[PDB]
Design a binder for this molecule. Structure first.
Ligand SMILES: [Zn+2]
Length: 103
């Protein structure tokens, strides 16, 4: 039904963002059916993208708006301090999307 993201994937994303800090982390999202459970690193179906911001804001940047139009329908933004409440998901049009974590 409605797309959800696995807890493990979320955790790996937050850890990768923290490790990239102060630089931005960027990667592709994927999975099977209705669960995001694949992380694809940059040098198959693509659900979307994920990238971080070294500051406390998850608001899409001008560039992000351009990124959202190319890879998948779900685009996650993770921001400092990269805890479980520092990310948001957006769709190709930059609108906010509700992405629940699997039990
Ligand atoms: Zn950005």
């Amino acid at each position: 039904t409605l797309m959800k993201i696995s807890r493990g994937l979320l955790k790996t994303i937050l850890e990768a963002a923290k490790s990239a800090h102060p630089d931005e982390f960027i990667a592709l999202l994927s999975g099977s059916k209705d669960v995001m459970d694949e992380l694809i690193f940059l040098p198959m179906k693509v659900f979307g993208t994920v990238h971080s911001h070294p500051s406390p804001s998850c608001r899409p940047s001008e560039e992000d708006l351009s990124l959202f139009t190319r890879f998948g329908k779900y685009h996650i933004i993770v921001c400092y301090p990269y805890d479980e409440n520092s990310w948001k998901c957006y769709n190709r049009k930059g609108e906010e999307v509700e992405l629940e974590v699997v039990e």
